[PDB]
Amino acid sequence: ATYSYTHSVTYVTDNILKSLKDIILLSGLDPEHFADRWESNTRAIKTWLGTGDLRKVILEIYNPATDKLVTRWDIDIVYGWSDGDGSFWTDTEQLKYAIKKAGLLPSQAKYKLMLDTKPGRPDVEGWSKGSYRSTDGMVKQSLGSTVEHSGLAGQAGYWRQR
């Protein structure tokens, strides 16, 4: 039936965040901090997907005793949306199997969501310029497309120690 770009945006937003929660949960971590940020994360992601400015959604999982990345989960946005498609899906099966592959985490591994955007993006309250933790000595792995609504898609990958 009929759908709008905002429908596709909303589907991808909720399911990116659902997927990241699942990653946190299945990685053995407490999703409470992710819940505390759900509202802020939703508004930022939905806004920058709506304007086409969101490039990547990133979850750094770091060791707080050394401040170095243990692992990192990326969702790259693919802007291939079409008004005459209508199909949608979320593929979290592959995410589950990649969790062993991403690496052993410390008991109290902490996490932080970050958003990579085009320069001309609109401001979103509370979000400001930040910096990536180093990925030196880490290896990117790709899981292919894990969420799509009507051509707007998210390609998931993870970084492991090499």
Partner: peptide, 7 residues
Amino acid sequence: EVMEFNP
């Protein structure tokens, strides 16, 4: 450019 949330 990367964005992070500051409470």
